[PDB]
Amino acid sequence: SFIFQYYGLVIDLLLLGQERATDLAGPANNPNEFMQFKSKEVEKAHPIR
Amino acid sequence: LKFVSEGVGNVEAQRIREQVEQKKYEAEYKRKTRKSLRDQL
Amino acid sequence: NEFLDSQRVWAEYATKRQEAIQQNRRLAFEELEGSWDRGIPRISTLFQRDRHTLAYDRGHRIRREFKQYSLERNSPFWWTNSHHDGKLWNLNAYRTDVIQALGGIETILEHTLFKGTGFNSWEGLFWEKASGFEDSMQFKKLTHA
Amino acid sequence: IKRRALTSPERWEIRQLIASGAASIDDYPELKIDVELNTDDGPKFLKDQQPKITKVPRGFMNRSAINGSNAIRDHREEKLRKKREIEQQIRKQQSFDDPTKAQRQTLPVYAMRSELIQAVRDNQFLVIVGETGSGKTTQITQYLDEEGFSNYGMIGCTQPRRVAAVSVAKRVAEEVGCKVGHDVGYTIRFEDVTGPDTRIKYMTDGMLQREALLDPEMSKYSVIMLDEAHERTVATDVLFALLKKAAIKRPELKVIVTAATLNSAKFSEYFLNCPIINIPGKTFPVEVLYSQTPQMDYIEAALDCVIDIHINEGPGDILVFLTGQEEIDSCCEILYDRVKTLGDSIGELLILPVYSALPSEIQSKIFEPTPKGSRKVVFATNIAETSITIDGIYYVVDPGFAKINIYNARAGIEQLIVSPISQAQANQRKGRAGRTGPGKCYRLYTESAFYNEMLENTVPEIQRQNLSHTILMLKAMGINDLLKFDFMDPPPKNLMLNALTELYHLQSLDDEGKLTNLGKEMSLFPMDPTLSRSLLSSVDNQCSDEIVTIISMLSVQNVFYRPKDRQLEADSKKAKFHHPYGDHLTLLNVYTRWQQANYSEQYCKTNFLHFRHLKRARDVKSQISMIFKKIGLKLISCHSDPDLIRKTFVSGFFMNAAKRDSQVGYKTINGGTEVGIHPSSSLYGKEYEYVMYHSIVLTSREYMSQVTSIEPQWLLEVAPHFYKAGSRKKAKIIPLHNKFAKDQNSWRLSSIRQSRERALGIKR
Amino acid sequence: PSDSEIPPLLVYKWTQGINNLSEIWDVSRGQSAVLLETTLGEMAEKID
Amino acid sequence: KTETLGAVDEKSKMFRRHLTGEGLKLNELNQFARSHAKEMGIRDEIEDKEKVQHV
Amino acid sequence: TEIKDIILGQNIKAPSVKRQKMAELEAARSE
Amino acid sequence: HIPRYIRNQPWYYK
Amino acid sequence: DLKDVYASKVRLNASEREELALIEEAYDNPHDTLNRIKKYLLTQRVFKP
RNA sequence: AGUGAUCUAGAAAGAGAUCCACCUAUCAUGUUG
Ligand SMILES: [K+]
């Protein structure tokens, strides 16, 4: 399960890209909870909501 | 609750009673703690 | 309804928790009575007997779902862990209402051989659900037949 | 101040709360070495070397003492039930969240004066006995001064209590006709009024013990009287053996010891078979009565005996002796119930507590006269055997028990044990009925239990208390072999080898058991060796102002007052002092804030503090500062670096460390005894992984007293001779509690095998 | 799956999450929302 | 059940047959041996090897 | 009684052993 | 002992 | 987690008994178990079918 | 403002190898101040 989810993270990063993945995950210092964003402008900044 | 004035009662009779009470209590404690046949099994 | 009631009982718990520390108290077990069997996870999980070890149990949901690949017989409740979620349902009222629907003990027993047993009361009807000849026999050397 | 890392139960609670969505990782700012004992062997002097509280150990009175009282427990199980039902009603009332919410010659002792002087001339020691109210304590020293014993040194007299030493010195001066200072003086801890011209000096036993640490011949004195020496304090017993040795050094040293009747022969046989002289006193006859039978429940016999007196006996106040604060409180309540129930059939009666933890203002209620037309019942500890005299008492009720302290030397545990009194203490109770008039003493135990199950004399403090401070002082006097020092009742070896182990690991002793220079400097301080060690390391660490303040607070009684009716204000005000790291720094907070407020009494009343104990801690701070000025030191402030403070206390208290085990709470590292944090602690519910403590007290449970957070690396750095890093890790583990099983070993293939074998009838 | 929620609560959270996106349902300016659901086929068996 | 054959105990609701003839003799001999145990001092609380001789 | 139970082969699990124990411990209370 | 689902009484009785 | 499988099956075969005995041994000897686990993690590179 | 819509049903001879819903677990310390 661990290996599977890690390889899945690789595929997630390929689908989302560094920038959008960072917006979704939030800064490492202060990560977003699931589906939330640090601001409405970040939420709207990219088509992948 | 009853009292007797100092010296009126015989103290060694009361000591005999307390010895009887002690050895009764101590024998009863063997009665309470000897490992029975069922316990040994 | 479970999710809405969970949001409610857990916001109430969060408020009581902050007041409990303001008073420098500990929350009593029966200071949360009535909420115990509510919430997702259940409030009762806060006082799970092994919580000091379960605090380290991580990845438990995926582990439970992945059991399908390593065990031939799996629990159909792969999606929930009673240690982490608590008891998420209670069907004890169904038995009571089915007895009522069937017409009560009287009507049910009229269908049985009960009267022929000469047994005194239906209350003493303790079925020996843990012993019998077949229970003595299952360990012995026996053929498939 | 570093955050206390959350224990696993707290991480669990936060995890479930976050899972629920009522809180988040935004709301919690958290989440963003094994120490073994050292396995070197001990020193050469321990390599070669490695109590009886009752007359009958399983006799009826000791069983009664251990069994407590059913009346007290049934009273708690009423108070608890009532408290719970009241809380339940309050909770349902809140559960609806409604949104808009020349006399001298009359004293008896003057009849004996010429004998009471020729005996002191012709003998070295004299074991004087004297009945209470004889005048011996004020008159003997004056008779010695009249007779020129004062020509060649002071006439010293020791009292076991400070207030006795002062009140007697002032009385003797008021009879000699002079001030205190000049002809008469006193010397007690924190106060010397002795002058250049002092003839007679009244002091505590502990002050003569510390003077003997400077001058073990005690050459400043012509005559030394040990008064009330029948109380057998640790200082008194050390003075006994000191004075036998000084007497051999000094033909001109006279000694007078105050015995009681029941240890007068003990004392005479000890002081070289010296004469005993008995002085009569101002006391009236007391009729003792005894129960006809054993009493199963001494609290219930005492309450009955009170009511029986009040109704059938004539005028006179009643003193009931009880073992501690909560029996007293329970008895005041139960008696008020019983009296109210008897109602119009009985006369008025008024009920009062007295005990040492009581505030002075409340204690002073007990010696107001009873209204004419009313009777007073006082429920007292042993505080009323000796320290407090109540006038007007005519009846004593003696259940026969007292709380006694024993130090469990190897575990470090102070045990308070209810145990039968001695015959000497029973006679000290008897006498209290006889001060006002021909009173009666009712003993709630048989006459045969008095003769045949009570010790004749009480076990002296020297056989029960921690001796490490005594051993440090005796070795500082150069008294190198603790048996050549002939204690009147030698201390158990159990307390010797543990005291020597403590002083050894503190580095006060060398590897052959000679005193070190560090032990020599530690002997200069009037406080326990672990506190002395911490203080000397605070001079090395330049943090002595804060450390001396905490040491002072650690040496006084509990500074927090928790009134039986205010356990919410007296907790939230107390919780305002709590330092995050625990009790030592909490006590520094308390003291500092009581210093920012101008040492004022009101500050203590308003924050629920004991002003009595705080102004004693202020006295201890001052004395330690005077000793620093004597050495020439200064009290440096570190400006409260709380790591530097806690490291400096580890330097003494490293042997008092405990670790959490998540299964069982704290276990001491030195011996593995499980201990709780006391609910009075700052650290209650703030479970740190490693703590140190001032002491352990067994009450209902072993509690650590004065618990403070430490890092384990400091144990390895401060005492590498006593601790080491971890290992014998061949312990075991158990599965989780599988709630639905009815046998939690049934998962084992071993027990499955046995279930199958049994079901097959296979015997194995 | 995540330890924080059972699958039904995951579905509920996801649905409420969509509903709470800013202007997600507005179509005045001709906007549109696309929900793509698909499987990462043979993901585990193709691991080098 | 008859009053001649036995009687109910009531405490346990059991019926006990009365002892007749040699039954009384045995019950009395039982008492005799039991006294003999207390008489010879073997008694009960004491782990004596001779006890087997008095049963 | 236990020795008697051994020679006679009395079932130790049986309630009679309990009741007999009480029938003799009541005498141990008697005197 | 009687199981809880037997001992408990439907609301309409009480 | 390994024990869970066995929590209520009363009938075991030789293979199941072997696994349950190994688990019981791991409960009785946790330190030796941890040592073995770490040694295998550090050095075992060839495994059984 | 209350209509309608109604499966089922046993005999002979063979066969059969097991596992996971499920009864709510804070102080009470003697005295020396
Ligand atoms: K066939």
SS3 sequence, D568-634? CHHHHCHHHHCCCCEHHHHHHHHHHHHHHCCCCHHHHHHCCECHHHHHHHHHHHHHHHHHHHHHCCC
Q: Characterize D550-574 residue by residue with b for buried, 16 or more Cβ atoms within 10 angstroms of its Cβ, and e for exposed.
A: bbbbbbbeebbbeeeeeeeebbeeb
**Three-class SS of residue D129?**
strand
Nearest to D354 by CA among D392, D328, D326: D328
Cα distance between residue D220 and residue D198, in whole Å? 11
State the Rg of chain H over Cα. Answer: 8
Distance CA D120, CA D217 (A): 19
Experimental method: cryo-EM
Q: Evaluate if the CB of D699 falls below 7 Å from strand J.
A: yes
Residues E13, A33: Cα–Cα separation, whole Å: 12
In 3-state terms, chain F is what percent helix, strand and coil (to 5)?
A: 45, 10, 45
Phi and psi for C14 in degrees, rounded to 5? -60, -35
Take residue F32 and report the two structure tokens written for it: 């005799």
CA dist., res. D402 & res. D522, Å (int): 35
* Bases on strand J under 7 Å from any protein CB: 17-33
Q: Which of B35, F41, F32, G24 is nearest to F50 (CA)?
A: F41
Answer whether C88's CB lies under 8 Å from C42's CB.
yes
Q: Is the Cβ–Cβ distance between D135 and D107 less than 8 Å?
A: yes
Beta carbons within 10 angstroms of residue D74's beta carbon:
13
Q: What is the secondary structure of D228-286 as a DSSP string?
A: TGGG--HHHHHHHHHHHHHHHH-TT-EEEEEE-STTHHHHHHHTTT--EEEE--S----
What value, to the nearest 5°, has the Cα angle with vertex D302 and ends D298 and D304? Answer: 120
CA-CA distance, C22 to D2, in Å (whole number)?
Answer: 21
**Residue D656: both structure tokens together:** 């008092």
230-259 of chain D touching strand J, CB 7 A cut-off: none
Tokens for D725?
């890093």
Nearest to D623 by CA among D518, D549, D541: D549
As a whole number of angstroms, the distance between CA D64 and CA D62 comes to 5
List the one residue out of D471, D461, D536 whose CA is nearest residue D499: D471
State the Cα–Cα distance between residues B41 and C3, nearest whole angstrom: 57
Q: Any atom of strand J under 7 A from CB of D90?
A: no
Contact D433, D396 (CB under 8 A): yes
* Contact assessment for residue D637 and residue D547, using Cβ atoms and an 8 Å cutoff: no
Write out the binding residues of D for ATP. Answer: 130-137
With contacts defined as CB-CB under 8 Å, which chain A residues touch E13? 34-35
- Residue B27 φ then ψ, to 5°: -65, -45
| 3-state SS track over D193-228 | CCCCCCCEEEEEHHHHHHHHHHCCCCCCEEEEEECC
- In total, chain G counts a number of residues equal to 31
- Secondary structure, 3-state, D337-376: HHHHHHHHHCCCEEEEEECCCCCHHHHHHHHCCCCCCCEE
**Among residues 5-44 of chain A, which lie with CB inside 8 Å of chain C?**
5
What is the Cα C22 distance to its own chain's centre?
35
Cα torsion angle, I38, I40, I42, I47, sign = negative
Q: State how far residue I2 is from chain C, nearest Cα, in angstroms.
A: 10
C-alpha to C-alpha distances, A16 to A25, D391, E2, E32, nearest whole angstrom: 11, 92, 20, 20
Q: What is the C-alpha separation between G7 and D131, in angstroms, rounded?
A: 72
Residue whose token pair is 């550090």: I42
What is the rounded CA–CA span in Å between residue D722 and residue D39? 8
Residue D515 DSSP class: B
Q: How far apart are CA D647 and CA D540, in angstroms?
A: 12
Please tell me the distance from the alpha carbon of residue F42 to that of residue F40, in angstroms, as a whole number: 6
Asked whether the beta carbons of D126 and D151 are under 8 A apart, the reply is: no
**How do D287-291 and D674-677 pair as beta strands?**
unpaired
> Angle between the D642-653 and D529-540 helix axes, to the nearest 10 degrees?
140
d(CA E9, CA C6): 11
F52 shares contact with chain B (CB less than 8 Å): no
One-letter amino acid at F6 equals G
Tokens for D253, please give them.
Answer: 């040293």
Q: Are residues D687 and D677 in contact, defined by beta-carbon separation less than 8 angstroms?
A: yes
CB atoms within 10 A of CB D332: 16
Query: Is the CB of I1 less than 8 angstroms away from the CB of C71?
Result: no
- The rounded Cα D537 to chain-centroid distance in angstroms is 27
**Closest Cα partner for D203 from D149, D247, D244, D154?**
D154
Q: Collect all residues with Cβ–Cβ distance below 8 Å to D560 and sequence separation of at least 6.
A: D570, D574, D608, D609, D610, D680
Q: Phi and psi dihedrals of F2, rounded to 5?
A: -150, 155
Residue D140 identity: I
CB C98 within 8 A of CB H6: no
Positions at the binding site of D? 130-137
Q: Tell how far CA D270 is from the center of its chain.
A: 28
8 Å CB contact between D262 and D427: yes
Dihedral of CA D2/D7/D12/D17: which sign? negative
Q: Which two tokens stand for residue D124?
A: 């070295």
Interatomic CA distance for residues D182 and D199, integer angstroms: 8
Spatial distance between the Cα atoms of A18 and A27, rounded to a whole number of angstroms: 12
Tell me the H-state helices in F1-55: 22-39
Query: By the 8 A CB rule, do D264 and D258 touch?
Result: no
**Residue B35 and residue D286: Cα distance in Å, rounded?**
52
Closest to D208 measured CA to CA, from D178, D182, D232, D188: D188
HEC states along D35-94? Answer: EEECCCCCCHHHHCCCCCCCCCCCCHHHHHHHHCCHHHHHHHHHHHHHHHHHHHHHHHHH
Helix D544-555, helix D529-540: angle, nearest 10:
170
B2-28 exposure pattern, b = at least 16 Cβ within 10 A, e = fewer: ebbebeeeebeebbeebeeebeeeeee
- Asked if residue D503 lies in contact with residue D467, where contact means CB atoms within 8 angstroms, the answer is no
* D410's tokens: 């190897």
d(CA D724, CA D24): 41
- Chain H residues 1-14 within an 8 A CB cutoff of chain C: 2-6, 8, 10
- Tokens for D304, please give them: 């009955």
Distance C142 CA to ligand 1 centre (A): 20
Is the CB of residue D218 less than 8 Å from the CB of residue D224? yes
- Which residues are CB-contacts of D510 (< 8 A; sequence separation ≥ 6)? D43, D516
| CA pair distance C81, C87, nearest whole angstrom | 9
Long-range CB pairs of C52-58 (<8 Å, 24+ gap) are C52/D7, C52/D8, C52/D9, C52/D12, C52/D662, C53/D8, C53/D662, C53/D736, C54/C83, C54/C84, C54/D12, C54/D736, C55/D8, C55/D9, C55/D11, C55/D12, C55/D15, C56/D8, C57/C83, C57/C84, C58/E3
Strand J: which residues 1-49 of I lie within 7 A (CB)?
4-5, 7-9, 11
- Tokens in use for D130? 């004297």
**Enclosing H/E stretch for D379:** strand D375-380
Question: Tokens 């911490």 belong to which residue?
Answer: D534
Residue type, D459: V
D538 contacts: CB under 8 Å, gap ≥ 6: D544, D546, D547, D548, D648
Judge residue D1's burial from the number of C-beta atoms within 10 Å of its C-beta, 0-12 exposed, 13-18 middle, 19 or more buried: exposed
D245, D213 Cβ separation under 8 angstroms: no
Give me the phi and psi of D80, to 5 degrees please.
-65, -50
Q: Do A8 and E43 touch (CB under 8 A)?
A: yes
Phi, psi angles (nearest 5°) of residue D203: -145, 165
Contact criterion met (CB < 8 Å) for B6 and D452 = no
Alpha-carbon distance values, D153 to D9, D147, D183, D198, D429 (Å):
69, 13, 12, 9, 38
Contact I20 D729 (CB under 8 A): no
Q: How close is the nearest chain D Cα to the Cα of I13, in Å?
A: 12
Peptide bond before residue C41 is cis, with ω within 30 degrees of 0: yes
Please tell me which of the candidates E2, E6, E12 has its beta carbon nearest to residue C80. E6
Cα(first)–Cα(last) distance of chain G, in Å? Answer: 19
**Contact D185/D253 with Cβ under 8 angstroms?**
no
For residue E12, CA distances in Å to A32, C1, C68, C121, E15 come to 19, 11, 25, 51, 5
Coil, strand or helix: which one is A49?
A: coil
F43: left (phi over 0), alpha (psi -120 to 50) or beta: left
Residues 6 or more apart from D282 whose CB is under 8 A from it? D107, D108, D132, D133, D134
Q: Residue F44: is it exposed, middle or buried by C-beta count within 10 angstroms (0-12/13-18/19+)?
A: middle
Tell me if residue D30 falls in helix, strand or coil.
coil
Neighbour tally for D264: CB within 10 Å? 19
**Contacting residues of F for B31, CB less than 8 Å apart:** 45
The H or E element that residue D146 is part of is helix D136-146
Contacts (Cβ under 8 Å, ≥6 apart) of D140: D109, D116, D128, D157, D225, D256
List the structure tokens of D61.
Answer: 């009175």
- Give the residue with minimal CA–C1' separation from J21: C77
3-state secondary structure chain I: CCHHHHCCCCCCCHHHHHHHHHHHHHHHCHHHHHHHHHHHHHHCCCCCC
3-class state of residue D520 by DSSP:
helix
